[PDB]
Amino acid sequence: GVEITEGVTVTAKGNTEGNTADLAIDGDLSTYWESSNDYKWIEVDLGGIYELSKIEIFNKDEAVYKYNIYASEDGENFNKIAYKNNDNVSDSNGNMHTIDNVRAGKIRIDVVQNSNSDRVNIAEINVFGKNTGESLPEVKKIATSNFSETPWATEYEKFNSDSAYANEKTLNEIKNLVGRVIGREFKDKFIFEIRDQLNGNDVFEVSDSGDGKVLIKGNNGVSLASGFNYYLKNYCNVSYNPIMGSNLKMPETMPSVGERVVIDTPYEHRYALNFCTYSYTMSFWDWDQYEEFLDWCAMNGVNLVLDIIGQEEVLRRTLNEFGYSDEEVKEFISGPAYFAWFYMQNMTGFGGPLPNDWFEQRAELGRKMHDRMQSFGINPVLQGYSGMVPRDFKEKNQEAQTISQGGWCGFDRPDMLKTYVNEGEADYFQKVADVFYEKQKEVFGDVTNFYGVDPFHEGGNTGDLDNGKIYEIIQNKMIEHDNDAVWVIQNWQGNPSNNKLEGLTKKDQAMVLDLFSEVSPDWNRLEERDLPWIWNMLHNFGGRMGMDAAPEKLATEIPKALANSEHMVGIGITPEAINTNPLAYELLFDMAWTRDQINFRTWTEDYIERRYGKTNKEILEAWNIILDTAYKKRNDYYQGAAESIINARPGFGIKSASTWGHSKIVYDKSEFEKAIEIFAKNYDEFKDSDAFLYDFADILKQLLANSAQEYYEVMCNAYNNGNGEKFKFVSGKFLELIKLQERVLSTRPEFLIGNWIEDARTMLKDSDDWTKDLFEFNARALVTTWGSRNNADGGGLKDYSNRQWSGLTEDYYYARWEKWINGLQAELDGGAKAPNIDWFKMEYDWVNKKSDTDKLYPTEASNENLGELAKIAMESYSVTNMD
């Protein structure tokens, strides 16, 4: 006591009606607030700062409810003060939570589970507290800097206008890159020089200085970094991949170049990044990770990178001009794990709202990135505008004409402004596009000529509009704000259609990304229409893992397409995540520096030696087996690596874990296993190489995925055929195979869910518990259910981003299979019939757990011996000895 029984109010961000926020606080147990959407929390204001001692919660029924409670004394930071996570039913007595006399002027109650419904409810909440006679501070409004007012603008224009200073900046930066990549002690071993292009082509040179140093030339930063990487690869037996394993062991003394090389590239652009990459991989990156990525980019020849960092701030400024408060902008914008699908006009709100601190920090990080890109000569691809608006835009802007875009995977797509209207009508496309490009100037300045936007990505609705005319006006509006603008358009599954593309009246000022050139090339339509286009290796879908690459097509199809085209202005990568198969990415970027088809077999041989720091006859044969199996050329259509059955929702006739995925292994399994035998045989010799271990974990977990499939098939034959003792035995081995897999996965820092979760929880500083918990939800949801019930199930997104990850395998994948088995056993043993499992409910239970109250996943890899684990795999859990 005493009960705060006066002056209290409540807000909510959604409700079924008329089950509205205030009904949670009316002193009436028969009336209740109930959620309608994914905002499953209410905010209660206490009429002043109290020292809470108790909070009492009643629900509308007797279901099992789980919730987390947060308080704020400053009006900004909401910290967790209490929670219910036990499995007790609610009853007429309510739940009483003892508080330790915490100062609170506001409280948040986030009901994360209702065992009975997708909706949550609070019938009543009483708060018990001592009045401090204080009030909450006024919360400060979001205030960001204008680019021109910042130290960033001065630097940007100084570099821009001053050759000598720009050259000095660039050369000193490449020096810094050397120190970051191989070590500070090697910096002074290189001399870097700016030269001209080679017949209008980007170009580098590697030669001796005369006094034992390496002299590297290049027309810009990326050429210089590419020359630095050429030298390491071809003279030092060194290989750099900050994400997927390196060998950075330098020779004791710097090896001579001998004959000077001059290497040019026929491609104006080398492109990197899907919109999805920003979500599946980069959601929770800090500057350390970004800087490290741009170093790897520059070193692989990349000079065109997609960039959406801080675009939340650009849009906030845009929407503020058209009737939207900052709270409403925050409700529009998704959480930090979802920006790919938010900027692709597919989904809103989900994972949000972002903290207020978000905007300033992200604008700053993007400003930082453009400074570094400027030194290298990497063009960012900023945002274009195509008419995207919230669904309530007309409400707030009545003369506005809009087009409803329908659903995407159970999500409500944002609206789209009519790209043109009739005479006599207000043209809001022109109004919002004018503000949008203007505001993107104010945040970042004139940093780029390349702008990316993609109306009607994976659905939508063109309404009454002419398809060509839509693309004409989008481009003409873009060129109006930058006369040198190039519209970067994705080419995904035959869209945009030809007649949309024919509406582009300035062909040289668009550039189409052929997204999936290595499985499903679709550039001939673009080439015929004289559109500048880029050949891209997509490769990776959703971050889903497995041994999968197309190195032969990369080594042949790229130069072939150059020879057979006039408008191929580049090559690139469009992966949905960068987490898998480094060979694939190194070869693609290596193909920029050649006009001829190469030998993918001898390129691998060379590759593996510099990646491991050494090679032998046996390692080579193991890799040839891989080239002959998992990496063997194929001519069918498929999206990513063949999927592991371990990662699939349990059932009969499973042919995938994700909706558009595939689990059919197209190579001989016993033949692939030979690679693992050879790796285990050579483990002791090669365990000094971290990239060897990484590659060994990759093939071994592939082996167990492969054999898991066979054991799965045998065990549900056993169920179907009535036995019995058989099913139990085979299902026993299946679960044990997963426990061995889990140990294989504990070995790599990159396979740890704890790194993923912690990165999310700590990506900002000064964060409250509310924000950390919410960013953890984003991290957990993405790799599992993706959205909520209607996105996971009806929307088809269940386990789209399934990861063969430690912790996730123990507590999610293994748990599902164990239950299903447990399960069919109770049936087969004279019980049951086995009930229908509501899988989403089980998956979403894990999604909503918090690291600081439930279980904290490790950020430290284990010392398990992959050679030993491999022996156990071959002996006990293989196809070869399967029986």
Closer to Ca ion by Cβ: residue 23 or 745: 23
Q: Which stretch binds Ca ion (CB under 5 A): 25-33, 220-228, 365-373, 588-596?
A: 25-33
Taking the complex as a whole, how short is the minimal distance between the CB of residue 541 and ligand NOK, in angstroms?
6
Strand partners, 58: 124
Taking the complex as a whole, how short is the minimal distance between the CB of residue 110 and ligand NOK, in angstroms?
26
Contact partner at residue 28 from Ca ion, ligand NOK, none, CB < 5 to 8 Å by partner kind: Ca ion
Nearest C-alpha neighbor of 256 from the set 194, 351, 189, 187: 189
Taking the complex as a whole, how short is the minimal distance between the CB of residue 330 and ligand NOK, in angstroms?
23
Taking the complex as a whole, how short is the minimal distance between the CB of residue 240 and ligand NOK, in angstroms?
26
Total residues binding ligand NOK (CB under 6 A): 9
Binding mask 511-530 for Ca ion (x = CB under 5 A): --------------------
Closer to Ca ion by Cβ: residue 31 or 449: 31
Task: Find all residues with CB under 8 Å of 234, minimum gap 6, and list them.
Answer: none
Residue 184 has phi, psi (to 5 degrees) of: -55, -35
Taking the complex as a whole, how short is the minimal distance between the CB of residue 422 and Ca ion, in angstroms?
50
Taking the complex as a whole, how short is the minimal distance between the CB of residue 58 and Ca ion, in angstroms?
8
Taking the complex as a whole, how short is the minimal distance between the CB of residue 864 and ligand NOK, in angstroms?
32
Binding mask 72-111 for Ca ion (x = CB under 5 A): ----------------------------------------
Taking the complex as a whole, how short is the minimal distance between the CB of residue 803 and ligand NOK, in angstroms?
14
Contact partner at residue 542 from ligand NOK, Ca ion, none, CB < 5 to 8 Å by partner kind: ligand NOK
Question: How many CB atoms are closer than 10 A to CB 535?
Answer: 25
Asked if residue 301 binds ligand NOK (CB under 6 A), the reply is no
Contact partner at residue 852 from Ca ion, ligand NOK, none, CB < 5 to 8 Å by partner kind: none
Selected binder of ligand NOK within 800, 817, 857, 877 (CB under 6 A): 800
Q: Which amino acid is at 449?
A: N
Taking the complex as a whole, how short is the minimal distance between the CB of residue 112 and Ca ion, in angstroms?
20
Place of tokens 């704890």: 754
* Spatial contact of 747 and 805, defined as CB atoms under 8 Å apart: no
* Spatial contact of 147 and 441, defined as CB atoms under 8 Å apart: yes
Selected binder of Ca ion within 16, 20, 31, 859 (CB under 5 A): 31
Asked if residue 492 binds ligand NOK (CB under 6 A), the reply is yes
d(CA 415, CA 413): 6
The CA-based diameter of the chain, rounded to the nearest angstrom, is 89
Token readout for 576 is 């949905």
Nearest C-alpha neighbor of 748 from the set 688, 679, 702, 804: 804
Contact partner at residue 534 from Ca ion, ligand NOK, none, CB < 5 to 8 Å by partner kind: none
Nearest C-alpha neighbor of 828 from the set 724, 740, 714: 724
d(CA 604, CA 607): 5
* Spatial contact of 67 and 111, defined as CB atoms under 8 Å apart: yes
Q: Rule CB under 5 A: which of 5-24 touch Ca ion?
A: 23
Q: Rule CB under 6 A: which of 779-798 touch ligand NOK?
A: 797
Taking the complex as a whole, how short is the minimal distance between the CB of residue 847 and ligand NOK, in angstroms?
16
Contact partner at residue 492 from ligand NOK, Ca ion, none, CB < 5 to 8 Å by partner kind: ligand NOK
**Is the bond into 496 cis (omega within 30 degrees of 0)?**
yes
* Spatial contact of 507 and 602, defined as CB atoms under 8 Å apart: no
Task: Find all residues with CB under 8 Å of 409, minimum gap 6, and list them.
Answer: 346, 347, 786, 787, 791, 795, 796, 797
* Spatial contact of 53 and 130, defined as CB atoms under 8 Å apart: yes
Selected binder of ligand NOK within 178, 276, 453, 554 (CB under 6 A): 276
Token readout for 816 is 């599902």
Nearest C-alpha neighbor of 710 from the set 669, 738, 658, 674: 669
Taking the complex as a whole, how short is the minimal distance between the CB of residue 340 and ligand NOK, in angstroms?
6
Selected binder of ligand NOK within 43, 45, 518, 576 (CB under 6 A): 576
Closer to ligand NOK by Cβ: residue 274 or 706: 274
The dihedral region occupied by 245, where left means phi > 0, alpha psi between -120 and 50, and beta the remainder, is left
Between the alpha carbon of residue 75 and those of residues 249, 615, 867, the distances in Å are: 52, 61, 55
CA 75 to chain centre: 32
Asked if residue 542 binds ligand NOK (CB under 6 A), the reply is yes
Contact partner at residue 417 from ligand NOK, Ca ion, none, CB < 5 to 8 Å by partner kind: none
Taking the complex as a whole, how short is the minimal distance between the CB of residue 460 and ligand NOK, in angstroms?
13
Got the DSSP string for 241-310? Answer: -TTT--B----SSPPP--S-EEEEES-SEEEE--TTHHHHTTTT--HHHHHHHHHHHHHHT--EEE--TT
Taking the complex as a whole, how short is the minimal distance between the CB of residue 559 and ligand NOK, in angstroms?
25
Token readout for 826 is 């109770």
Q: Which stretch binds Ca ion (CB under 5 A): 27-35, 506-514, 545-553, 564-572?
A: 27-35
Closer to ligand NOK by Cβ: residue 626 or 797: 797
Task: Find all residues with CB under 8 Å of 690, minimum gap 6, and list them.
Answer: 245, 246, 247
Token readout for 49 is 């700062």
d(CA 743, CA 721): 33
Taking the complex as a whole, how short is the minimal distance between the CB of residue 840 and ligand NOK, in angstroms?
16
Got the DSSP string for 308-325? Answer: -TTHHHHHHHHHTTTT--
State which H helix or E strand residue 342 sits in: helix 339-343
Token readout for 543 is 């971050």
Q: Which amino acid is at 156?
A: Y
Selected binder of Ca ion within 26, 51, 357, 668 (CB under 5 A): 26
State which H helix or E strand residue 843 sits in: helix 839-847
Contact partner at residue 274 from Ca ion, ligand NOK, none, CB < 5 to 8 Å by partner kind: ligand NOK
Selected binder of ligand NOK within 35, 265, 274, 397 (CB under 6 A): 274
- Minimal CB distance to Ca ion: which residue? 31
Contact partner at residue 870 from Ca ion, ligand NOK, none, CB < 5 to 8 Å by partner kind: none
Task: Find all residues with CB under 8 Å of 617, minimum gap 6, and list them.
Answer: none
Closer to ligand NOK by Cβ: residue 190 or 516: 516
Contact partner at residue 576 from ligand NOK, Ca ion, none, CB < 5 to 8 Å by partner kind: ligand NOK
Contact partner at residue 31 from Ca ion, ligand NOK, none, CB < 5 to 8 Å by partner kind: Ca ion
Binding mask 563-602 for Ca ion (x = CB under 5 A): ----------------------------------------
Nearest C-alpha neighbor of 804 from the set 582, 640, 643: 643
Closer to ligand NOK by Cβ: residue 513 or 676: 513
CA 64 to chain centre: 34
Asked if residue 126 binds Ca ion (CB under 5 A), the reply is no
Taking the complex as a whole, how short is the minimal distance between the CB of residue 537 and ligand NOK, in angstroms?
12
Q: Rule CB under 6 A: which of 836-855 touch ligand NOK?
A: none
Taking the complex as a whole, how short is the minimal distance between the CB of residue 378 and Ca ion, in angstroms?
57
Token readout for 269 is 């652009």
Strand partners, 98: 54
d(CA 591, CA 589): 5
Closer to ligand NOK by Cβ: residue 512 or 716: 512
Q: Rule CB under 6 A: which of 313-372 touch ligand NOK?
A: 340
Taking the complex as a whole, how short is the minimal distance between the CB of residue 68 and Ca ion, in angstroms?
21
Question: How many CB atoms are closer than 10 A to CB 538?
Answer: 23
Token readout for 783 is 């790799």
Selected binder of Ca ion within 3, 28, 286, 868 (CB under 5 A): 28
Contact partner at residue 800 from Ca ion, ligand NOK, none, CB < 5 to 8 Å by partner kind: ligand NOK
Positions that interact with ligand NOK (CB under 6 A): 274, 276, 340, 492, 515, 542, 576, 797, 800
List interacting residues with Ca ion (CB under 5 A).
23, 26, 28, 31, 124
